[PDB]
């Protein structure tokens, strides 16, 4: 999502935030 929309959500939920997650892996990982 754009950076302005993430800033809008960080203000709306200021004080009750988690760490921002990035794009997920392209495939399902596997335990070696």
């Amino acid at each position: 999502p754009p950076e302005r929309e993430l800033s809008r959500l960080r203000r709306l939920y200021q004080g009750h935030l988690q760490e921002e997650s990035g794009p997920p892996p392209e495939s399902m990982p596997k335990m070696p």
Binding site: S21, P25, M28, P29, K30, M31, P32
Partner: protein, 119 residues
């Protein structure tokens, strides 16, 4: 038993015995008991894999389309079944839960490698 308001819903009614669940897909008034009176049975769902390693799901698509066309709602587990069948789109939470599982296993794979590297 006329209820105050309410509506029809396509949902899963639990059957079977202890540790052996079996679901019947039914259209029923949302206020009725889970396993009680229903309007029509629209299929079934066996969540336990059979001898062929399969989860069997029966869908009366003709009657499912009829009751949706008559104003029937869908429970969340029912929406996910229709998404898996390709009848509906994949539910937003099936997609999101899959991404969460990928991030979860990407951290475990990273922790495992860091441990082997230290070894």
């Amino acid at each position: 038993k006329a209820y105050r308001g309410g509506h029809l819903t396509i949902r899963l009614a639990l059957g079977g015995c202890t540790n052996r669940p079996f679901y019947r897909i039914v259209a029923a008034h949302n206020k009725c008991p889970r396993d009680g009176r229903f309007v029509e049975q629209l299929g079934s769902y066996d969540p336990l894999p059979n001898s062929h390693g399969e989860k069997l799901v029966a869908l009366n698509l003709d009657r499912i389309r009829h009751w949706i066309g008559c104003g029937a709602h869908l429970s969340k587990p029912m929406e996910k079944l229709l998404g898996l069948a390709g009848f509906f789109p994949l539910h937003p939470m099936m997609i999101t839960n899959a991404e969460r599982l990928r991030r979860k296993r990407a951290r475990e794979v990273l922790l495992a490698s860091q441990k082997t590297d230290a070894e």
